[PDB]
């Protein structure tokens, strides 16, 4: 389920992951009305992301900008100009 990812559509992936990760499921005793009692346990708000995740997102944005610069350089004549680099050098 972690390997399976959707982008562009709202899915119940988080609900399935919460159902699988709840220790009652690991216990093996599954009841017909078990989900209604634990409905809001699975449905919880997102947690504040750790600063490492924000750093990874910023790095991804920077690298996407670098890749787009590389594409534009590929379309250009001066392929080896130092300006085409994404060093951010001063």
């Amino acid at each position: 389920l972690r390997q399976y990812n959707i982008v562009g559509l709202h899915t119940n992936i988080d609900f399935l992951l919460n159902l699988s990760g709840h220790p009652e499921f690991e216990a093996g005793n599954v009841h017909t009305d078990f989900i209604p009692q634990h409905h809001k346990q699975l449905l919880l708000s997102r947690k504040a992301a750790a600063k490492e995740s924000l750093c990874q997102a910023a790095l991804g944005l920077i690298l996407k900008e670098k890749a787009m610069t590389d594409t534009f350089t590929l379309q250009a004549h001066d392929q080896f100009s130092p300006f085409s680099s994404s060093s951010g050098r001063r």
Binding site: H77, P82, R89
Partner: protein, 541 residues
């Protein structure tokens, strides 16, 4: 077919040698001092001025430049030390203006941004000189100009050095109009109030962007209107983006804030409809075979010692590959062909005193490079120019004149780098400022003067002694000391790289370890314009 194995320059330096240790220590100290001074200059006009500037909701000029250019793109700032201790009691960081070359929407552009935190953006004479130099570079290299205008006009107490002359404030408008006539785009972004003079900059630009309640264009400010005519009016009603866009027609775009103005500027640059075309052969780039920091050990800070320029060449060129031309004739000069970032270059460097053979070899190599349309790179390390009776009988001056004329008449892009001393007519012979190189950089250990201090002192002392003897008057030794010591001190002060960079005598002091990179950028910016044919004068054989 480019598969032939070729020998490369460069030798591994002796890292255990005490001379290497001392040279590395001295150069590292110089570079650290340079970096600290650059940081202090970057701090800006002052803390209170920055706080007031932020309180108005405006961006600092360096933030404007960072948000304007393409993300992650390198920025080549020019003349970071303009105005450094130039005036006795006034501090003018960076000359009060920021000029540089960057990449906007994939196009190399010259950005000129006024620093409103330095005397409200008033124009000191050094500011005018820096802006004129940037405009000249843009004209020569055919680069679009972007003026982030936030200025308070000419600095009144120094008006006599700002207003009237040819290379004074009016030359800015002259260059703007001329470059507009040559299909070189001019874009003016009015980020703040322009009291006077600066109001003409958006008017003469091809396209304008003005912030809503920050930028206000008016020929005369409310104080100036009150002083001249006596009419009282507010700044917004006198200028204002709404009042200019709606009925004046001066403004071409209307921006909510600085970010919107920069976005509009990027859109305009994209709509410029320009494409770079290269008229030189290109080869895949390759790194040099030796580290660049070793130059610190190789060069050092003492000019009395001498080093082989081939070390620098091997440390800067691609793959350390160098094809020397006339290696054994005129050994004191090193001329050859190399490549930097794939661009072909003809390197001419000094390795001693200039002789007749060296001048002839330099003239021949310059002729070859001009014929083949190859950019030229000069490396100045001048101990002096050969002088003597037998040399005058052989026309050492006439060979120097040959080299000077050949360098002056050249039309290929020329880039000069002063890695050591630069004295006498040798500076002219190696493409000094007077001979219009596209760029000129110096290392933090250079020295530039008409001659050495002791040589000038001796010349003056001999002149005075001979004149007194002809007159019949005694010339005592105390007079000799009083004539010599001030000359020595003055020549020592005026030769400092920081003294030469406070005035705009170069495009900045560069860390040697960065040299290669800077050159690359410069050469890229030098290749926007097409290379014309070279017409030479009379070669006095």
């Amino acid at each position: 077919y480019h598969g032939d194995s070729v020998a490369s320059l460069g030798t591994q330096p002796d890292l255990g040698s005490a001379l290497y240790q001392e040279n590395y220590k001295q150069m590292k100290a110089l570079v650290n001092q340079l970096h600290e001074r650059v940081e202090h200059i970057k701090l800006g006009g002052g803390e209170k001025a920055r706080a007031l500037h932020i309180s108005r909701g405006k961006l600092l000029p360096r933030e404007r430049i960072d948000n304007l250019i393409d993300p992650g793109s390198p920025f080549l700032e020019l003349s970071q030390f303009a105005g450094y201790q130039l005036y006795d009691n006034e501090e003018v960081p960076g000359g009060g203006i920021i000029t540089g070359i960057g990449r906007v929407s994939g196009v190399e552009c010259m950005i000129i941004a006024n620093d409103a935190t330095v005397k409200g953006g008033a124009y000191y004479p050094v500011t005018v000189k820096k802006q004129l130099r940037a405009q000249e570079i843009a004209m020569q290299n055919r680069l679009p100009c972007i003026y982030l205008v936030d200025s308070g006009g000419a600095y009144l107490p120094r008006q006599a050095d700002v207003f009237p002359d040819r290379d004074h404030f009016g030359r800015t408008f002259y260059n703007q109009a001329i470059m507009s006539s040559k299909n070189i785009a001019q874009i003016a972004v009015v980020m703040g109030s322009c009291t006077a003079g600066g109001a003409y900059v958006p008017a003469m630009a091809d396209e304008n962007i003005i912030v809503r309640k920050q930028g206000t264009i008016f020929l005369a400010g409310p104080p100036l209107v009150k002083a001249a005519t006596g009419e009282e009016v507010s700044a917004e009603d006198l200028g204002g983006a709404d009042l200019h866009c709606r009925k004046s027609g001066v403004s071409d775009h209307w921006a909510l804030d600085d970010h919107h103005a920069l976005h509009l500027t990027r859109k305009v640059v994209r709509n410029l409809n320009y494409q770079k075309k290269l008229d030189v052969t290109i080869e895949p780039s390759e790194e040099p075979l030796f580290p660049a920091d070793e130059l610190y050990g190789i060069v050092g800070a003492n000019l009395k010692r001498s080093f082989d320029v081939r070390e620098v060449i091997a440390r800067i060129v691609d793959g350390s590959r160098f094809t020397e031309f006339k290696a054994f004739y005129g050994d004191t000069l090193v001329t050859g062909f190399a490549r930097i970032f794939g661009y072909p270059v003809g390197i001419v460097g000094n390795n001693g005193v200039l002789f007749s053979e060296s001048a002839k070899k330099g003239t021949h190599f310059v002729q070859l490079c001009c014929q083949r349309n190859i950019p030229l790179l000069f490396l100045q390390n001048i101990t002096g120019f050969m002088v003597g009776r037998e040399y005058e009988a052989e026309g050492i001056a006439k060979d120097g004149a040959k080299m000077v004329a050949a360098v002056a008449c050249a039309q290929v892009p020329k880039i000069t780098l002063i890695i050591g001393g630069s004295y006498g007519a040798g500076n002219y012979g190696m493409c000094g400022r007077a001979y219009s190189p596209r760029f000129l950089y110096i290392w933090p250990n250079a020295r530039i003067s008409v001659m050495g201090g002791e040589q000038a002192a001796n010349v003056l002392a001999t002149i005075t002694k001979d004149q007194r003897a002809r007159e019949g008057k005694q010339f005592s030794s105390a007079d000799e000391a009083a004539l010599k010591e001030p000359i020595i001190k003055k020549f020592e002060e005026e030769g400092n790289p920081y003294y030469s960079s406070a005035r705009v005598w170069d495009d900045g002091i560069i860390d040697p370890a960065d040299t290669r990179l800077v050159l690359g950028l410069s050469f890229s910016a030098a290749l926007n314009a097409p290379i014309e044919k070279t017409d030479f004068g009379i070669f006095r054989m």
